[PDB]
Structure 1
Amino acid sequence: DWVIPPISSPENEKGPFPKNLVQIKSNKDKEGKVFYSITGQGADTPPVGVFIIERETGWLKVTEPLDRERIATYTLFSHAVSSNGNAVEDPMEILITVTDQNDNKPEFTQEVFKGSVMEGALPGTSVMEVTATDADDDVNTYNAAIAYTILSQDPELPDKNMFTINRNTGVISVVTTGLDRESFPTYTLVVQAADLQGEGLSTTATAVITVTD
């Protein structure tokens, strides 16, 4: 019988590498001397040797930092073979779960979003929408929970804050009066998407709004 603890590792672990994960053991090691080995993706198939085992101890180690956004789980198999060359266990499936760190900034679907708005659109009128995604773990963390803000407006006329953004949805609305195509035909907004509900990593893009008659 196998004696193995469940295996979880954060991505981007600090060295020194390699790092000990768990000891792997058969309780048939009391009947004789056991050679341990691992197969599977990350072991003996690409990427090879991310995970390795010390032969006699059964210490399973990781040789380099993991990246949950490339491989989020590995499925390995442990093997146990006597000094005489016969397997003394059936291979045991071992799942290695890679847990998330906030290591991806939000990414806007476009670098420049375009929208338009009619002169004398009523305050509260939805104009356009900007959208960012985040490659981090949106299930177990806030590492992909994006808040949207506006950083700047060009020009700042007739008011500095002609528009607002919905911090959850990225919808941009007119919030003041005095749009004038003839004087200010276009507004260039810098928008920001930041994870950890606005407090974390951040990225900026541009929204270009044309004022129509």
Structure 2
Amino acid sequence: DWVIPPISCPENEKGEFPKNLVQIKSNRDKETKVFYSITGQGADKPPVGVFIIERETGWLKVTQPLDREAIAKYILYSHAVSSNGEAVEDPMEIVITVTDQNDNRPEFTQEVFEGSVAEGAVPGTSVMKVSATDADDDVNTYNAAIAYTIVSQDPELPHKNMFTVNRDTGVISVLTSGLDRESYPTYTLVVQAADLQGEGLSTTAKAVITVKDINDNAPVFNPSTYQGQVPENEVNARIATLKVTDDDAPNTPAWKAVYTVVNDPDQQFVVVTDPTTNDGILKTAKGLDFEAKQQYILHVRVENEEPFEGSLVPSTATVTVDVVDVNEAPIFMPAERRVEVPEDFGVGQEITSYTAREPDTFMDQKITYRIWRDTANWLEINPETGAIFTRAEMDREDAEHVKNSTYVALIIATDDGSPIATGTGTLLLVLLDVDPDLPP
């Protein structure tokens, strides 16, 4: 029927007890002596005795400072009973709503939040999420209005303001540029939650950013000037091993070295990387024939399996490479000498001067012409200038030693330098007739 508006008593109302709330009355209180009582939880049921009525007057009282976190609304019930025991009124519902108070400082879901970010992080980029919770009601007051701030970064370098937390989501982001893993790879932050939109109760926690690796460090030679040498006509010959220091995380693609010869037109050099140390093993891809080039002054540059991040400004070494002239065999020119000679050729006369080229350009080398393969003893080559003279009577009809009207004999031009390199040339002595004979 007619009732009583919901009552409000502030949480933790402190002062003297007990306090009045509102008195109730039955219009039947002059019909008979009526006796009031209140029931429900908070009254007779737990928490028993927080609220009470004066049986005589019907005054409802609260006994103690309320706590809404504990219990934010009591549902009580009043009764009117005559003195002769008959219940007079159908019980009236009485609702007490305890109102809120900033009596609950905020608190982080975690003692310590931890996250990570790229070394080369784009300011305003997002790292981490920090959170906290207040126990009053944000539905009705700013007492659960949590406002995150940051109050300390360790280390406070390069700046003191590397990151920031979104005031009212808790999301931590990159504020500035300068996160170098190579420099400060972990950042410890004390993050603060405060209720009353930061104005009220402050509770602090921790958030740790390990800034991680990013190929942001070119490999470096030491020094830029190397120096060595190769047997000129050798292949797979180590020229020199060159040293570099990638500052990035070790053993990571962003660390291991890729070398490249920039000035190698002939594809005659190869520098392979030594896994364990990523040194530059400078070899030869093709045996360097000395005479054309006495020295190679070439550069070699460094990289990483992992492509460089951003601008690329790669380091370069200079290996002033020296080849050494090795004594090679001289080359009969031509190697297949064919000449026609009348079988009736004079004994002791010159046939022809068969010669050889000198490959090693020592302006100081000589050649010795001899002959071994004289099947039938007719020839005798001048040891000095390759001159050939018959020292016996030739005959084209001379069978066996004359294959097919042609007589083959092997000549030699031995060398005069380091090792004894004996060039070999061939004379085809073609004897045409001068009955076993040939027409006419």
Tell me which amino acid in the other structure corresponds to 1:55: R
Q: Distance in 2 between matches of 1:98 and 1:204?
A: 29
Give the 5 Å matches for 1:26-65. Answer: 26-65=26-65
TM-superposition CA deviations, 1:51-109 (whole Å, max 9, x none): 11111111111111110001011111101000111011011111110100111011111
Corresponding residue for 1:98? 98
In 1, the alpha carbon distance for the partners of 2:27 and 2:194 equals 51
Q: 3-state DSSP class of the match of 2:28? A: coil
Once residues 74 and 44 of structure 2 are traced to their aligned partners in structure 1, the CA distance between those partners, rounded to angstroms, is 12
Q: Spell out, residue by residue over 1:172-212, the C-alpha distance to the aligned partner (whole angstroms, 9 max, x if none).
A: 11111121223212111111111111111111100111111
Query: Residue 182 of structure 1 aligns with which residue?
Result: 182
List aligned pairs for 1:200-211, cutoff 5 A: 200-211=200-211
Any conservation in 1 of the 2:109–2:131 contact (CA below 8 Å)?
yes
Query: Against the structure 1 CA distance between its residues 113 and 149, is the aligned structure 2 distance closer, same or farther, given a 3 Å change threshold?
Result: same
In the superposition, relative to structure 1, how do residues 110 and 127 fare at CA in structure 2: closer, same or farther (>3 Å)? same
Q: Distance in 1 between matches of 2:209 and 2:26?
A: 67
Paired residues of 2:80 and 2:89 also in contact (CA < 8 A): yes
Distance in 2 (alpha carbons) for counterparts of 1:8 and 1:23: 14
Cα distance in structure 1, aligned partners of 2:74 and 2:28: 26
Question: Do the aligned partners of 1:2 and 1:25 also contact (CA within 8 Å) in 2?
Answer: no
Deviations 1:151-179 (CA, angstroms, capped at 9, x unpaired):
11110111110001110111111111121
Where do 5+ consecutive residues of structure 2 fail to align? 214-440
Whole-Å separation in 2 of the counterparts to 1:72 and 1:109: 24
2:167 maps to what in 1? Answer: 167
Q: Which amino acid aligns with 1:18?
A: P
In 1, the alpha carbon distance for the partners of 2:138 and 2:4 equals 30
Kindly state the Cα deviation for residue 5 of structure 1 after the two structures are TM-superposed. Answer: 5.0
Distance 2:90 2:144 in 1: 41
**Which has the bigger relative contact order, CA under 8 A and spacing at least 6?**
1
8 A Cα contact 2:6 2:97, kept in partner: no
Counterpart CA distance in 1 for 2:141 and 2:26 is 36
Task: Identify which range, 198-207 or 173-182, moves more after superposition.
Answer: 173-182
| Alpha-carbon distance in 1 for matches of 2:30, 2:3 | 13
Runs (4 or more) in structure 1 with deviation over 6 Å come to none
Distance 1:188 1:3 in 2: 59
* Structure-to-structure mapping, 1:17-166, within 5 angstroms: 17-166=17-166
TM (norm. structure 2) is 0.47
Secondary structure of the residue aligned to 2:167 is coil
Taking only aligned residues, the RMSD between alpha carbons, in angstroms, comes to: 1.3
User: 2-side partners of 1:211 and 1:2: how far apart?
Assistant: 68
Could you tell me how far apart the structure 1 residues matched to 2:24 and 2:42 are? 17
- Rounded to whole Å, the distance in 1 between the matches of 2:114 and 2:68 is 34
For the residue of structure 2 that corresponds to 1:44, the secondary structure is: coil
* Amino acid corresponding to residue 54 of structure 1 in structure 2: E
Contact in 1 for aligned 2:117/2:210 (Cα 8 Å): yes
Q: Deviations over 1:130-158 (max 9, x none)?
A: 01111101111111111110011110111
What is the distance in 2 between the residues matched to 1:3 and 1:166?
49
**Code of the aligned partner of 1:103:** D
- Separation in 1, partners of 2:212, 2:5: 65
- SS of equivalent residue, structure 1 residue 143: helix
Give the superposition deviation at 1:2: 6.8
State the aligned residue count.
Answer: 213
Q: Which amino acid aligns with 1:185?
A: P
Q: TM-score, normalised by structure 1?
A: 0.96
State the match for 2:16 in structure 1.
16
Instruction: Tell me, yes or no, if the aligned pair for 1:2 and 1:26 is still in contact at 8 Å.
Output: no
Q: Percent identity?
A: 87
Q: Bigger radius of gyration, 1 or 2?
A: 2
Q: Which amino acid aligns with 1:56?
A: E
